[PDB]
Design a protein around this ligand. Structure first.
Ligand SMILES: [Zn+2]
Lengths: 82, 50, 60, 119
RNA sequence: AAACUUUCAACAACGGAUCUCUUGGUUCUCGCAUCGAUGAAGAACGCAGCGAAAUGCGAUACGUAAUGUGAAUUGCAGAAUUCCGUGAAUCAUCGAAUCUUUGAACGCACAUUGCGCCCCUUGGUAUUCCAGGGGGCAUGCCUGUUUGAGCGUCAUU
RNA sequence: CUAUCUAGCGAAACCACAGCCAAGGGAACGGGCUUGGCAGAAUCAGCGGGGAAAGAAGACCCUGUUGAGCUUGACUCUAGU
RNA sequence: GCUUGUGACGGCCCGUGAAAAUCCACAGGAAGGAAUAGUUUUCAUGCCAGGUCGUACUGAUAACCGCAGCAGGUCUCCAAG
RNA sequence: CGUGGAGGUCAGUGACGAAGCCUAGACCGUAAGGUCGGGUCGAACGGCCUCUAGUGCAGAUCUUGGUGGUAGUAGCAAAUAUUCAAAUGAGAACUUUGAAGACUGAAGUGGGGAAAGGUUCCACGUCAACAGCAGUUGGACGUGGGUUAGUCGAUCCUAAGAGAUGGGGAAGCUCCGUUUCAAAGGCCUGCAGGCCACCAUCGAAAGGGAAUCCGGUUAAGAUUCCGGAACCUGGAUAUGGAUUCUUCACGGUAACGUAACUGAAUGUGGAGACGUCGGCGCGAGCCCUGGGAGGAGUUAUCUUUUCUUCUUAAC
RNA sequence: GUCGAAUUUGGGUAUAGGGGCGAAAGACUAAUCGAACCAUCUAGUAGCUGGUUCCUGCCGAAGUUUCCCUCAGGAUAGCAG
RNA sequence: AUAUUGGCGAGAGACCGAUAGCGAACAAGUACAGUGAUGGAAAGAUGAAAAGAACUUUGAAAAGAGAGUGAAAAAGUACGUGAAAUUGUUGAAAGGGAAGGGCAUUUGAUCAGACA
RNA sequence: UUGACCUCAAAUCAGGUAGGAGUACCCGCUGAACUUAAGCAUAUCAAUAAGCGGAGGAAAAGAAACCAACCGGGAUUGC
C-alpha cells in the first residue's frame, strides 16, 4: 500500500532551481535553498560538511577576477603601459 | 509541460545541444584520448531532474 | 523568416528591418525555438516581394 | 590580416563609425554566405576587426574624459586606480607621515646616530 | 571400445594479475601577503569555420588593445595583401577596454525572462499617450548643504 | 493455460569435498570412519523420505558490571509556578 | 428520452454556504456655458498601436513515479443504437 | 629463507636480449626457498656486508575485480485470435498493403488535456547495441526539420497564508509582529490654492478576470498561419447628428421610453459575489422518425426496402 | 463492506524530530518510527565473537591458592622460558 | 622574535606507485543516486613513427582468407607484458556407488650424470 | 514682526563607508556527548568538537596597580 503504488502519487516538486546555487534545492513552500541558503545573504556552509564546503568553494569555478590578481600584485599594481 | 517556464525551456535547449555524439575530427587530433562522449543523456533511461 | 536575439521584441525588429532593408512591414510573429533562439516570421505588405528581396540578400 | 589599430588610431570618431558599420554589413552578408557554403572563416577577421575598432573608439572617449578630468579632485570611479579595495581605503603617504609636534621635536633633538666600536 | 568424467603439457579463448613505466599524489623546508559595492566568490546562459565536454572568454565572447619574441597553427580547408615586416602564432607578457542574466546584489519583485517612477534624446500631430535609445531610482551610518517641525527656547517689534 | 518435446533466448538460491545402505563406537542419530551387505556407462519425466537442506551471526532462555521506551513517593537535578 | 444549461419554487441546517481587484449608476451641485452665433466626444462615423513568456507530442498494459517498455498507482471533459 | 627501499662493494648481469610469465625438464637445500635448461617477452636487474620497514595469507559470513557447477535448466503461460496472398528485402510467425475473421463496444484499447516528462512528435537514412524470441520495423541509432496569438493562458486581484519596513527581544546566525506607540504621501490648478490616508510586497496556468469566430492549410503547427468577417483596450482626433435665444433634450397617467441629451470633489448603492438536494417548465446538442431530392448496398424470392448527404459560426 | 455524507479527491496553504499529526493502533511522519533522514563528534567504547600471513631447532606449561558488585574477567602466588 | 593542512610562488624526500598514493595520475567532486540535506564512482600504457592494413578473392555485410607495412601483428584501435580460476581442441592415461594422498614396487613416458 | 539658539527630521542632496567570500593560523562568545572511572551521578574527555560574531599577514599581548623578600630584578611573546 505504501511502496510501489504509493510512489505513483509523486508529481509535486517540493523543490525548484535557485538563481544562486543553480541546484534543484530551492524549497517552494519554505522559500529556501537548503544548499545555498538563498534568499539569505550568508552563504550556507557548515564545518561538519567539509566535503560540501569544497564542492562549492573558490577553486570550483571560473574565478573571473581573482585569477589575475597575483599577476597584478606581482607587477605591483601597475599603471600605464610600455 | 505545455505551459512551462522560460528558464526551463532555456535548459531544454541546453540539454538538446548537449545530447549528441562526438565530432569525429577530434579523434584525429594529435594526442587525443576521447573516443566517445561520456556525458550523454537519453530520456528513456536517465533524467535531468529538470 | 529570421533568427533574432532573445532580448529583441517586435518593435525593435520591425524598426530594424525597415532600417536595414528599406521595407514596409505589415506584421510580425515571433517564437522561441527549442534550440534556444528566437525565430521571427515577418509578413510584408503587398508593395514588396519577399522573394526578390531574398535573392537581393543573396539567400535563395 | 585585415585592419590595424595603429592605422585606425590616427582616424576620427566618424570615420571609425563608418568603418564599423561597413564591417557589420559585411558580416551580415558573410553569415548569409556561410549557409550557402560549407565553411567560411573570413568572418573571423571581420569579427576581430569590429573588436579592434570598438576598442579604439572606447579608448578615444576614455582618454578624452581623462584629459577632461585632468587634475581634478573627484575622478570617476571607473577611472580611478583599481589597486585593491583595502588599499583604495587605507592611509596615504601624507596621513602615514603625519606626526605630532612633540614627537617631531624629540626626533630632531635625538635621532639615531651612526656609531662604531673600535677605539 | 567410443562418449562422459578427471589429471598433465601445448595451442587458442575468458580475465587483466605480474613486471617495467608515470605530465599524479603525499610529506617536509623556504619565501611572500593580494578578495569584495571601482560589484567578489559562486551560478546560469551563450561564444569557435567545422565541438559534445574540458579549458578560455562575455554580444568586442577559445577573445580586443599595448608590450616582448620574431614566422606559425595543424584533424581539414582557409589563408599569407610577406616572411628583411609596427609583423605569424590558441606564443609569452599584461599595466588599457569589453565584461550577457544573476549573485552580498542595490527600483520593486523573482517557480515571473513580471510591473513601475525621474532626466535627456529620437519617431509617430503629442508637456500628458505609445515605442526606441541613453542614463538613473536600495538600506543603515558619517561628515557636511539646503529646506523644515516643536509654547523646547532666547531677544526684539 | 501449464508442465512435457522442439526454434530462439536464457537467470537465480545453494556449493568444505561430495553423494547406496545396516550395526558399532563416536560430541552418546555418520555421506565419509571400523566390520559387513554390495557395486556397470550416459540417463529422462515426476517425486517430495533424507541431505540433523537453504532461507536469517535466534526474537524464547541466561549472561553482559551493553542499551532504549514507559512508569513511580527509587537516587539526583530541572524549565515552570 | 440522454447529456447539459437554465428559471421559478419547495426542503435542508445550532452548518445559512470567501475576499479583493474592477466596472457602473445615483444623491450631490463645484465649475463652465449660446446668437452671427456656442456647447457637447456614454449617438454614429472616422485614424494609429496593442509588448513579454508558453504554445509540438504522450498523458499511459511503451513517453509520468515505481532501479525496467513492471498486469501497479496517478486528476479531469465529451460518451451513439 | 624470502619482499620493498637506502649506504657501500662486485671497474657485477643485460637489447647478441633485463626483469616478468609457463615448463609432469634438470640440480642444491631436512625445509623456508635458491639455481640452471627450453618456450614466450621486450628494458632494466642482481650477488655480498650493512641499514630501514606500510615486509611473507587459505581462512576473518574479510575488501575490489573476475570466472564456474547449478543449467542451455527454472523458465519466457493473465488481458478471448488469428489466418491467406503479394511487394520489400540476403533473409519475414511478427514490416507495409490488400483480403478474411475478431475485440475494446463509448463508464472504449476512442478523442482532448492539467501534473510530470522533455523533442519522445515529423521526414530521410539506418539494425552494431535495446525492443528478455525475431527483426527489413521502432518512443531505437544517425542527421535534419518543426511549436507563429491585441482576443487562449501567464501577466492583475486577492484567500488560507507567508513576509520586509518602524520598533522590540536576542551574545548571535536571528526571533516577534504586518490598524506597528512611526513625522510612513499623492489628487487635482516654479508657485500660490485647495481635499484625502493603515499605503509594502508575494501568494490560484481549476477561484474573480475586457475582447474572436468561421472555412481552408502542414510531413510535423494553428481560436496562434492564410482568406473573410468581428470584438476590446488605449490614444489621437475631425465630419455628421444632437442641444441653446427658456442656454445645459423631449414623449408617456405611470410602470418607463429614446441614436445623443453638461455635471467636479464628496458620499450612497449595485454588480464581481457564490451552498446543496428534490422534482416541474423552457431551450441547445444528441437520439428516434416522415416526405422529397442525390449516391451506395440487397435483389433464387420478398423488401414503395437497408445505409448515407440535406450544415450554417462568432458578431 | 459503503456508495449522498462524519463522502471521496486535485491543487494551494500550516504544523518538524523528544518535535509534529493522531475518530488512539504506539499508528503515520518519503518502502525507514517504543523516537525519522544527512553529516559530524567517530576508527565512540566493547571483561564478548571471528580472524591474525615463512622454516627449522631447543625448552615446555596451566585450568590451583588468596582478594575483587568477582564467577565468560583481572591482580597476586604457583607451573614455563 | 612566534603561528600557519588556507592562498601564491619555489626547492626537496631512504614515501605510494594505477585495487596503492588526495575520493580524482584520464573531459572527478565528473558520471550516477536521493524530494532534500547529502552521497559519490570506475576509468592510465599500440608502435619509433599509423607506417592504423592499399589491392584481390568469398560473403548482403560484419568478417574471413590472401596480400602488405612494421624490428616484431606472438603490437592490429577489444591493441605493452598478458598470469590463475575457467573453458575448447589435440595428445597420453585411468575409471563397476566419488576423487585425492603416505610407504613400496612393477609397468609405461621421460631425464641428467662417467671417461679420452 | 524679525532674528537667533537647543532638539529632531527629510532630501535619488555633495562626497564617503559596512555588508558577503575565505576562514591553516588568530581574538572572543556560546557550548556537548560518546568516552575514562573496569558500574555511575562529581570529576575526566573539555574550558574540546559542533554553533555565532570579527581580523591580519601575522594576529593577540606588551612598557608593571609586575616578579619578589635576594646583596634584589625590571615591557611582551616564544624555546
Ligand atoms: Zn538555491
Amino acid at each position: 500500500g505504501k511502496g510501489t503504488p504509493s510512489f505513483g502519487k509523486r508529481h509535486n516538486k517540493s523543490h525548484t532551481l535557485c538563481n544562486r546555487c543553480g541546484r534543484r534545492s530551492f524549497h517552494v513552500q519554505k522559500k529556501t535553498c537548503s544548499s545555498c541558503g538563498y534568499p539569505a545573504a550568508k552563504t550556507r556552509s557548515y564545518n561538519w560538511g567539509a566535503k560540501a564546503k569544497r564542492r562549492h568553494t573558490t577553486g570550483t569555478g571560473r574565478m573571473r577576477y581573482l585569477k589575475h590578481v597575483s599577476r597584478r600584485f606581482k607587477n605591483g599594481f601597475q599603471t600605464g603601459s610600455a | 509541460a505545455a505551459q512551462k517556464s522560460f528558464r526551463i525551456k532555456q535548459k531544454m535547449a541546453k540539454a538538446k545541444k548537449q545530447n549528441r555524439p562526438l565530432p569525429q575530427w577530434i579523434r584525429l587530433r594529435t594526442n587525443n584520448t576521447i573516443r566517445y562522449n561520456a556525458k550523454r543523456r537519453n530520456w528513456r533511461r536517465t533524467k535531468m531532474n529538470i | 523568416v529570421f533568427q533574432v536575439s532573445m532580448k529583441a521584441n517586435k518593435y525593435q525588429i520591425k524598426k530594424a528591418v525597415k532600417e536595414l532593408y528599406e521595407v514596409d512591414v505589415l506584421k510580425v510573429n515571433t517564437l522561441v525555438r527549442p534550440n534556444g533562439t528566437k525565430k521571427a516570421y515577418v509578413r510584408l505588405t503587398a508593395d514588396y516581394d519577399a522573394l526578390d528581396i531574398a535573392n537581393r540578400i543573396g539567400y535563395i | 590580416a585585415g585592419v590595424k589599430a595603429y592605422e585606425l588610431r590616427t582616424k576620427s570618431k566618424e570615420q571609425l563609425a563608418s568603418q564599423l558599420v561597413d564591417l557589420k554589413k559585411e558580416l551580415a552578408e558573410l553569415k548569409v554566405q556561410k549557409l550557402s557554403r560549407p565553411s567560411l572563416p573570413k568572418i573571423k577577421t571581420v569579427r576581430k576587426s569590429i573588436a579592434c575598432v570598438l576598442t579604439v573608439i572606447n579608448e578615444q572617449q576614455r582618454e578624452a574624459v581623462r584629459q577632461l578630468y585632468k587634475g581634478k579632485k573627484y575622478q570617476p570611479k571607473d577611472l580611478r586606480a583599481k589597486k585593491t579595495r583595502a588599499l583604495r581605503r587605507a592611509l596615504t603617504k601624507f596621513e602615514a607621515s603625519q606626526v605630532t609636534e612633540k614627537q617631531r621635536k624629540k626626533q630632531i633633538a635625538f635621532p639615531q646616530r651612526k656609531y662604531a666600536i673600535k677605539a
